[PDB]
Amino acid sequence: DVKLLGAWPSPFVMRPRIALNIKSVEYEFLEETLGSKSQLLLESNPVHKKIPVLIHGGKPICESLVIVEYIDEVWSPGPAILPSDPYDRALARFWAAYLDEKWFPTMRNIAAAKDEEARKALIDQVGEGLVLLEDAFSKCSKGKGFFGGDQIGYLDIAFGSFLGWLRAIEKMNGVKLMDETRTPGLLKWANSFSSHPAVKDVFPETEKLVEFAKVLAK
Numbered sequence: 001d002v003k004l005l006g007a008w009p010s011p012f013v014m015r016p017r018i019a020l021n022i023k024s025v026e027y028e029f030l031e032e033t034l035g036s037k038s039q040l041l042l043e044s045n046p047v048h049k050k051i052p053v054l055i056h057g058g059k060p061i062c063e064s065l066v067i068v069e070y071i072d073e074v075w076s077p078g079p080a081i082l083p084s085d086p087y088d089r090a091l092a093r094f095w096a097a098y099l100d101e102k103w104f105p106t107m108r109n110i111a112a113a114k115d116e117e118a119r120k121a122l123i124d125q126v127g128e129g130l131v132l133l134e135d136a137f138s139k140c141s142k143g144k145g146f147f148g149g150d151q152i153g154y155l156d157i158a159f160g161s162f163l164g165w166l167r168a169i170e171k172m173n174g175v176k177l178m179d180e181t182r183t184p185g186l187l188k189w190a191n192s193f194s195s196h197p198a199v200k201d202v203f204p205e206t207e208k209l210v211e212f213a214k215v216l217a218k
């Protein structure tokens, strides 16, 4: 009754997936294949032609974050994904928004860098980006293990959905962007997320993510 269109290595595809595992909503996973586009996609998401795409009642929903909020709402009876306080809720959205427009582009844009400089510059920001989210974690979690708190939340999805890749870009660049000193909470959090039940069977393997990068090469 629920169809999801994405691919094993898209962190955006992980977003509507985790959320579905939180509500216990089952779904059909319509894989896409590199370099091509299924007609069901070109059909269902004609504006961006991007994955993921949620299909619910014969209807399509687009933009991973919006799908997550829709999922939180259609299945309100289960564990709530977004926070509950109007302000707390707005915080999660600010950071998700920030992560999507600046943090991730910056971190992906690395590979494209060239002089070992720009490379550093990017990596530098990726660091500054983490120090903050380590700060946001500090208030957001109140000594609990997730942005959401005791349990997995909206901000854990958005930001956690990138761990496989960040773990992968680390390896392929001989750099560790999280460390005991500067982000000791996230280091701990990044391993209480990629192990969470709603994540552990939808989280890609760093290595597999590394073959795929080495493949997106050309």
Ligand SMILES: N[C@@H](CCC(=O)N[C@@H](CS)C(=O)NCC(=O)O)C(=O)O
Binding pocket: 010, 011, 012, 032, 035, 036, 037, 049, 050, 051, 052, 062, 063, 064, 065
């Ligand atoms: N920003 C979109 C997804 C961003 C995006 O670029 N998605 C990629 C996956 S990494 C995609 O759809 N690629 C093109 C395709 O093959 O359809 C969202 O937040 O839902």
